[PDB]
Amino acid sequence: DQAGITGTWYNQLGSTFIVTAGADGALTGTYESAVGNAESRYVLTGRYDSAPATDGSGTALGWTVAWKNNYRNAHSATTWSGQYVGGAEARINTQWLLTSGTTEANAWKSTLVGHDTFTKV
Amino acid sequence: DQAGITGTWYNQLGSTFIVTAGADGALTGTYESAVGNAESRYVLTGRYDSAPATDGSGTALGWTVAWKNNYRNAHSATTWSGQYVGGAEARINTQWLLTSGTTEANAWKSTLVGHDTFTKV
Amino acid sequence: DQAGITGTWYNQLGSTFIVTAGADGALTGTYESAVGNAESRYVLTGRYDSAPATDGSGTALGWTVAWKNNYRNAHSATTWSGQYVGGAEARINTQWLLTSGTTEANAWKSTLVGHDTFTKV
Amino acid sequence: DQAGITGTWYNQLGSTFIVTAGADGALTGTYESAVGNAESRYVLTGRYDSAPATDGSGTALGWTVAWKNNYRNAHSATTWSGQYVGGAEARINTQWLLTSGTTEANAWKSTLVGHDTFTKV
């Protein structure tokens, strides 16, 4: 699914996920969030299963953005964990964890959780 | 915190997290899980905040392992999202999401969640 | 939103959530899962914010099912945490945690996470 | 484990969980958070597996607090999902989801996730 995954994806918020899937299981690219204290593109890296099951299961993958670029630094990082589902209506279905750097007193409220769906349209 | 993060870490399960923190915010290394249907080392990549706050907050970071290596393929990926806390008892405190590739019928049970604490000892 | 919440809801899997919202903030009712090792109705209880904000925000709520009834016992419990959004297309948007009873050796894989959307249709 | 669960528990933050486990699988009681915009006790309700496995597994349970009492209303709700582990050092190990009521524009950041461990000491 290297060809399937590589490209430009969009989630339900209008964020833009630009990724290249490598033969070796690497994901590399950029993320632009349509929401929050973020602007322009941020570096991402991740991994995917380069030899998925052939029984109709999705392709497991994940990636990370640290929210620092040349414009802003939110002192936080999001990881998306999900699966790629190929086909006419290809999708990447994810759950994510957004951790902020906090003091120890605030560490109990360091992490947001949510879910994003990415499509090619 | 490039020097702080780079090195060998261990979690509460006895898993081994070997990481190099790059000047550019990259994390690269290997993960060896002491539990589950996994053996030996797996590639990891991720990102960290290379310019954290100076107010005593932790350093946000995340990384991904896809559970495929030369020995086994679990058709799954884990992402850890957390923060590095420096000091005499340095720690990386994380939450994680483990997504399996599933059929659409099983997608509701695709994702495990948990929490790992890493130390240098 | 006592009148808004009280009633029969359905999620994207076809599960049926029957709830009564009490004046005192209580949720009581039954849950029937369309998926997994579950059959018929299970008791639920929970809580909701009986005096929500008037600024257009949703109404926070949560509930629990333990997966034991007169037919089956899965030795597990799900909690849904979410918000009620009123209007022509009323919705309850949730995230959930499904914890199984495990041995200590298996505790790292005790908890599934996911997300359900409930509608009145 | 009705006798095991019933009583006063404390988590790693110093919060106080007062619960009664009913014969019918009900949890009822009060929660006092040592952190956040909360004061005094809040009502809780939940469920537990009243007929757990006898193979050494923990006892699955969950509960909900809506953060409204006679003193404050945070317009939010937390659900804890976990298991009770009996013995000399009895514990309730949980993960939790804290959902705030939000506008639709802010719904992506409605939910915090974390983990609490409760002990009888």
From Swiss-Prot, chains A, B, C, D:
One cellular-component annotation, GO: extracellular region
> Superkingdom of this entry's organism?
Bacteria
Record domain Avidin-like: where: 3-121
List keywords of the entry alphabetically. Biotin, Secreted, Signal
Compartments, record wording? Secreted
Subunit details for this protein? Homotetramer.
**Which protein, by its recorded name, is this?**
Streptavidin
Q: Organism, per UniProt?
A: Streptomyces avidinii
